């Protein structure tokens, strides 16, 4: 009667809280004490990409570590050639308010979302020479915040109507709906094998989803405010989040627990984006004081600063082979680092 | 001078692309963008009909100056209000005749205070509209409303000295419609710090003048911002 059955909430929730204390024998800061630090990391700006004329919201690296796509609120989608700073394509959008973009792992397609409730798919390799829109995916009742391709026919996405959805592109329909969040969903991250994904939301919680079945499996609550960024460890047994309360955290799957926090006392502003380097030693975060920090993921000890942006850092990604790091910002510039 | 014959034709493709990027970014430079908020029951549907002749977009032009309006058709207005941090003005529409519908005016006062004291709108100014004055006149006089019941501070409230009443109306509706106008000004003239200012108005459903009162306020917003940084104001 909504008073006795929600008395079984904390009757059941303290079983989970008093079993994460049983499976905690030590700390990540007690095991990585004896190893040496990485020293100092000194990256330089090698390239600078010019031409967006307005704020940049999202970018995504191609899978050959040479192409990239970026999205700006002037209504333009640009494909870059990062080695020579050439422009391959420039695609106009119908809505200027775009919030995300994605590059397909085959290289044939590009997706983008935004404040309209539809997710557009664009075809790059056409016979007639130009770039056309192939299908618009309608069915959400809020703004789109993130989207990632699985193959040329399946794309997953998150939205401001508190739900996530799996799509079939060739028909244009929703096939699976992931419900359970309370607030708006801001970010998602796919696994290296597209079988599970993770997503963080504005209720200070992140949860792990099974793609084929379609249900929640685990829930992680350690933050104090809204979660804006998420990314998997390259192993597939950990992920890391970034929030508004000036703290990144690292969570475990098989332990179902938080085991590291990345904070400093002179930082008070929120984290906008988070990525990993391969082997998972470096943890890069894009902050709100116009900088970018390069954390050491095993000892939680700050070991680098990527300064050089005039405005807010919006997005950052790392190539698949590990060569470069790109950063995007509100001052209409993209910078290719080390 | 080391490029291939195909490497030179890809450089020529890149220079032809950003020639079209500059001609698109220079035809959108002197276009002013307006964010239209509201409270649902207000007449922001029919103000769009006045200002004209997912998200929704209105486009009009006054005196060869282009304007560009938006409407986001809840509990958290966060995580999308930060996109509109470089607009010219926010247009706020409040139905000023609903104080007894229960409380549909304190709900509008709680919304205006959240918009004002937001960190992404520190330099954004608000054009305020108090429409449905046709319903406010028939409710104060010759009615059962008695504003002193729903608000416990209307009871003293002498009429301000800067009031310019429209000729023919009673002093009862003039003490009423200036009390609701000053309730919004008490939140704006408390933390503005010279960075942004409110601009109240009075309108109805059959009044057709509201494109001129947006054109004139957008000029006064830009003049008051450049005069502040030259230390003339």
């Amino acid at each position, epitope marked *: 009667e909504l008073d006795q059955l929600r008395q079984e909430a904390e009757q059941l929730k303290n079983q989970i809280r008093d079993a994460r204390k049983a499976c905690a024998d030590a700390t990540l800061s007690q095991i990585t004490n004896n190893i040496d630090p990485v020293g100092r990391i000194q990256m330089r700006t090698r390239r600078t990409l010019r031409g967006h004329l307005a704020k940049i919201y999202a970018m995504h690296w191609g899978t050959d570590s*040479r*192409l990239l796509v970026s999205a700006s609120q002037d209504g333009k989608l640009i494909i870059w*050639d990062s080695y020579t700073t*050439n422009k*391959v394509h420039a695609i106009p959008l119908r809505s200027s308010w775009v919030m995300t973009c994605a590059y397909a792992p085959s290289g044939n397609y590009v997706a983008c979302g935004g404040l309209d409730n539809i997710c557009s798919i664009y075809n790059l390799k056409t*016979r*007639e*020479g*130009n770039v056309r829109v192939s299908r618009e995916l309608a069915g959400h009742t809020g703004y789109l915040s993130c989207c990632r391709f699985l193959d040329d026919n399946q794309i997953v996405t998150s939205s401001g109507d508190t739900t996530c959805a799996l799509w079939d592109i060739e028909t244009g329909q929703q096939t699976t709906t992931f419900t359970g969040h309370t607030g708006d969903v801001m970010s998602l991250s796919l696994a290296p094998d597209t079988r599970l994904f993770v997503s963080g939301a504005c209720d200070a919680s992140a949860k792990l989803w099974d793609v084929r079945e379609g249900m929640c499996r685990q829930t992680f609550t350690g933050h104090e405010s809204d979660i804006n960024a998420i990314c998997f460890f390259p192993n597939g047994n950990a992920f890391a989040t970034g929030s508004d309360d000036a703290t990144c955290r690292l969570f475990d799957l098989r332990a179902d627990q938080e085991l590291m926090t990345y904070s400093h006392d002179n930082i008070i502003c929120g984290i906008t984006s988070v990525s990993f380097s391969k082997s998972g030693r470096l943890l890069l975060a894009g902050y709100d004081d116009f900088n970018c920090n390069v954390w050491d993921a095993l000892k939680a000890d700050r070991a680098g600063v990527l300064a050089g942006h005039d405005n807010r850092v919006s997005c950052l990604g790392v190539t698949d082979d590990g060569m470069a790091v790109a950063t995007g910002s509100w001052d209409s510039f993209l910078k290719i680092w080390n | 001078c*080391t490029l*291939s*014959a*195909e*490497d030179k*034709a*890809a450089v*020529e*493709r890149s220079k*032809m692309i950003d020639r079209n990027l500059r001609e698109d970014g220079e035809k959108a430079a002197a276009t002013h963008r307006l964010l239209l908020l509201g409270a649902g029951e207000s007449g922001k549907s029919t103000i769009v009909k006045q200002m004209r002749i997912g998200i929704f977009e209105t486009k009009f032009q006054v005196d060869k100056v282009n304007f560009h309006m938006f409407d986001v058709g809840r509990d958290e207005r966060r995580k999308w209000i930060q996109c509109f941090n470089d607009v010219t003005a926010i247009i706020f529409v409040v139905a000023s005749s609903s104080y007894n519908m229960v409380n549909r005016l304190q709900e509008a006062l709680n919304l205006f205070k959240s918009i004002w004291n937001n960190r992404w709108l520190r330099t954004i100014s608000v054009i305020l509209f108090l429409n449905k004055q046709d319903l406010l006149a028939e409710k104060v006089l010759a009615g059962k409303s008695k504003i002193e019941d729903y608000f416990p501070e209307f009871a003293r409230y002498t009429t301000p000295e800067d009031a310019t009443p429209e000729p023919g109306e009673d002093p009862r509706v003039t003490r009423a419609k200036y009390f609701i106008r000053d309730e919004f000004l008490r939140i704006s003239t408390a933390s503005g710090d010279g960075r942004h200012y409110c601009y109240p108005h009075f309108t109805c459903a059959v009044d057709t003048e509201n494109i001129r009162r947006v054109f004139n306020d957008c000029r006064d917003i830009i003049q008051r911002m450049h005069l502040r940084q030259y230390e003339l104001l």
Partner: single-chain antibody
Amino acid sequence: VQLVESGGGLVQPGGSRKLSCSASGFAFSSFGMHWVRQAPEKGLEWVAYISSGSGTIYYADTVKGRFTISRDDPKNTLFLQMTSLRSEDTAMYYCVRSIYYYGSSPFDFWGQGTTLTVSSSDIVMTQATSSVPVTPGESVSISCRSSKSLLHSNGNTYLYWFLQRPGQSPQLLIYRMSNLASGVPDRFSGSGSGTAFTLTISRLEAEDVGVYYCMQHLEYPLTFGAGTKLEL
């Protein structure tokens, strides 16, 4: 995608003639165009070029200063103006579209050609085989060679392969020595390094009968091979 040429005919030696290439079905203004001719007892020979935007125009040395190329973008029409036609200007003039960016495929669509009868340092590409007999079950290999190494310092190798089955216009098989064109079966495969190149056919159907050409695209002018005829 369509390209239709018209304008050819019998020209007295010394006059003039206009040619047209009417495009249809694709975004004509973002493509660069070429003219390629073929004398009735010779192979393929490049003529001219005009870039996307009319900002780069090249010519061949046997027509430089005598031929004029021009394009009309919003009417989708390519022009070639010839003056003082010699007796060695008897060929079939083709019209080829070509786009250039990272990963693109140049020279991937040809027209049908018009006929113009006239009454009365360079990289040399060597294709030193006249004819090869085949039978539709067995492998066959063609070779081509160059005076200069076509490998560039970035990492590309600008060698192309074309096939002209008789009674038709050529088509693209291999671009940049390793990559298949669209709508081509995977039994074709090119290989080589630096100066020696090979094209491989595994199981011949009845359609794999005709002349095979090799082209280089390292620098201008573009020089073809002599051609290798396959026959049953």
